[PDB]
Design an enzyme around this catalytic site. Structure first.
Site, PDB file in Angstrom:
ATOM      1  N   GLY A   1       0.733   6.190   9.375  1.00  0.00           N
ATOM      2  CA  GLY A   1      -0.611   7.019   9.016  1.00  0.00           C
ATOM      3  C   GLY A   1      -1.539   6.243   8.262  1.00  0.00           C
TER       4      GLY A   1
ATOM      5  N   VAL B   1      -1.434   2.269   8.156  1.00  0.00           N
ATOM      6  CA  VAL B   1      -0.133   2.009   7.456  1.00  0.00           C
ATOM      7  C   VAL B   1       0.893   1.914   8.285  1.00  0.00           C
ATOM      8  CG1 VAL B   1       1.348   2.526   5.397  1.00  0.00           C
ATOM      9  CG2 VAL B   1      -1.103   2.908   5.152  1.00  0.00           C
TER      10      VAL B   1
ATOM     11  N   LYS C   1       0.172  -1.875   4.621  1.00  0.00           N
ATOM     12  CA  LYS C   1      -1.477  -1.596   4.713  1.00  0.00           C
ATOM     13  C   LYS C   1      -2.261  -2.754   5.485  1.00  0.00           C
ATOM     14  CE  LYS C   1      -4.824   0.791   1.966  1.00  0.00           C
ATOM     15  NZ  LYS C   1      -5.099   1.443   0.778  1.00  0.00           N
TER      16      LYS C   1
ATOM     17  N   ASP D   1      -8.506   9.520  -7.514  1.00  0.00           N
ATOM     18  CA  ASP D   1      -8.196  10.207  -6.337  1.00  0.00           C
ATOM     19  C   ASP D   1      -6.764  10.957  -6.257  1.00  0.00           C
ATOM     20  OD1 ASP D   1      -9.105  11.600  -4.065  1.00  0.00           O
ATOM     21  OD2 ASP D   1      -8.732   9.921  -2.798  1.00  0.00           O
TER      22      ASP D   1
HETATM   23  N1  LIG Z   1      -2.184   2.684  -0.381  1.00  0.00           N
HETATM   24  C1  LIG Z   1      -1.251   2.945   0.000  1.00  0.00           C
HETATM   25  C2  LIG Z   1       0.014   3.111   0.302  1.00  0.00           C
HETATM   26  C3  LIG Z   1       0.494   4.097   1.724  1.00  0.00           C
HETATM   27  N2  LIG Z   1       1.616   4.252   2.118  1.00  0.00           N
HETATM   28  C4  LIG Z   1       2.687   3.703   1.128  1.00  0.00           C
HETATM   29  N3  LIG Z   1       4.135   4.063   1.467  1.00  0.00           N
HETATM   30  C5  LIG Z   1       4.604   4.902   2.396  1.00  0.00           C
HETATM   31  C6  LIG Z   1       3.717   5.745   3.111  1.00  0.00           C
HETATM   32  C7  LIG Z   1       4.055   6.789   4.117  1.00  0.00           C
HETATM   33  N4  LIG Z   1       3.104   7.713   4.933  1.00  0.00           N
HETATM   34  C8  LIG Z   1       1.800   7.078   5.271  1.00  0.00           C
HETATM   35  C9  LIG Z   1       0.828   7.728   3.935  1.00  0.00           C
HETATM   36  C10 LIG Z   1       0.978   9.261   3.715  1.00  0.00           C
HETATM   37  C11 LIG Z   1       0.037   9.630   2.674  1.00  0.00           C
HETATM   38  N5  LIG Z   1      -1.469   9.392   2.929  1.00  0.00           N
HETATM   39  C12 LIG Z   1      -1.473   7.804   3.334  1.00  0.00           C
HETATM   40  C13 LIG Z   1      -0.494   7.642   4.423  1.00  0.00           C
HETATM   41  N6  LIG Z   1       5.474   7.162   4.055  1.00  0.00           N
HETATM   42  C14 LIG Z   1       6.468   6.637   3.345  1.00  0.00           C
HETATM   43  N7  LIG Z   1       5.804   5.303   2.370  1.00  0.00           N
HETATM   44  C15 LIG Z   1       2.447   3.057  -0.026  1.00  0.00           C
HETATM   45  N8  LIG Z   1       1.144   2.766  -0.393  1.00  0.00           N
END
Ligand SMILES: N#Cc1cnc(Nc2cc(NCC3CCNCC3)ncn2)cn1
Ligand SMILES: N#Cc1cnc(Nc2cc(NCC3CCNCC3)ncn2)cn1
Length: 248
Positions: free
Chosen positions: A10, A12, A27, A107
């Site tokens: 998402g 990422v 990221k 945030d």
């Molecule tokens: N900045 C930052 C960040 C974004 N995802 C991270 N790990 C994830 C992300 C994820 N889904 C994408 C995210 C979900 C929440 N909104 C931003 C993108 N699922 C599992 N682990 C760690 N740090």
């Protein structure tokens, strides 16, 4: 050393190590500051930072397989109170840690609260974070940052404000959402009817009506307009609901 980019999360993406099959959230893309702050962080309720590489900048961050907190919240319902209290305890542990090293997230909201495989909450995304204490001296903030439904009222009305009460406020909005499955107002301004209603203590209205009196009493102390009168975290830790034994 080799990672396969498996799918978009998402941007990422999920990377999986070719050899170990360990997973990492990568990221791809202020960024220099995000890295600097990430290098400071090490806490069980904060997303892990593994490192970075410049090529386009790559940040290697914790993959939280449990998803985002947002997805444990049933619209118009919330989640079981014991689950919300546990997440809230973990949120406070994470925020206490950050504030202790002089960092404010700025945030906090369910989209930025991820869950590991054991549903441990992890504070995510330090792109808007900043230093508010350095060499034991506090600096007041003035930049508009955050997300309106979660932002504290002083950001909208004051030129300068203390960092810590702003993060406390957003955690209160998160708690409300966990317990009621809805956000209380579009923004905390006098022009906002729902916000005026709260200030006039109309707790017979939604979302407050859905919330038990014990956690609601905590919310009455967090969502206080004057940030100087607002409850601090050490006092949240002494709150009755905060310390109430709960079992599903
Ligand atoms: N900045 C930052 C960040 C974004 N995802 C991270 N790990 C994830 C992300 C994820 N889904 C994408 C995210 C979900 C929440 N909104 C931003 C993108 N699922 C599992 N682990 C760690 N740090
Ligand atoms: N793509 C990509 C990528 C990810 N991590 C990199 N550096 C790392 C990765 C790393 N991962 C170790 C943990 C070990 C437990 N499971 C998740 C990963 N630890 C330290 N440095 C370099 N490139």
């Amino acid at each position: 050393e080799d990672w396969d980019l498996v799918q978009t999360l998402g941007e990422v993406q999920l990377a999986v190590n070719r050899v170990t099959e360990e997973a990492v959230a990568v990221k791809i893309v202020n960024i220099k500051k995000e890295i600097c702050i990430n290098k400071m962080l090490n806490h069980e309720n904060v997303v892990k930072f593994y490192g970075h590489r410049r090529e386009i900048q790559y940040l290697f961050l914790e993959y939280c397989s449990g998803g985002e907190l947002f997805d444990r919240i049933e619209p118009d319902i919330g989640m079981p109170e014991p689950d919300a209290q546990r997440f809230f305890h973990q949120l406070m542990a994470g925020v206490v840690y950050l504030h202790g090293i002089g960092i404010t997230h700025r945030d906090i909201k369910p989209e930025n609260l991820l869950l590991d495989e054991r549903d441990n909450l992890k504070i995510s995304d330090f792109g808007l974070a900043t230093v508010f204490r350095y060499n034991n001296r506090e600096r007041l903030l003035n930049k508009m940052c955050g997300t309106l439904p979660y932002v504290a009222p002083e950001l909208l009305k004051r030129r300068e404000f203390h960092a810590e009460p702003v993060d406390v406020w957003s955690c209160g909005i998160v708690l409300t959402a966990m317990l009621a499955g809805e956000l209380p107002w579009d923004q905390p301004s006098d022009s906002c009817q729902e916000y005026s209603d709260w200030k006039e203590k109309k707790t017979y209205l939604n979302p407050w009506k859905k919330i038990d009196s014990a956690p609601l009493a905590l919310l009455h102390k967090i969502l206080v307009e004057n940030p100087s009168a607002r409850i601090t975290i050490p006092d949240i830790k002494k709150d009755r609901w905060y310390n109430k034994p709960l079992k599903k």
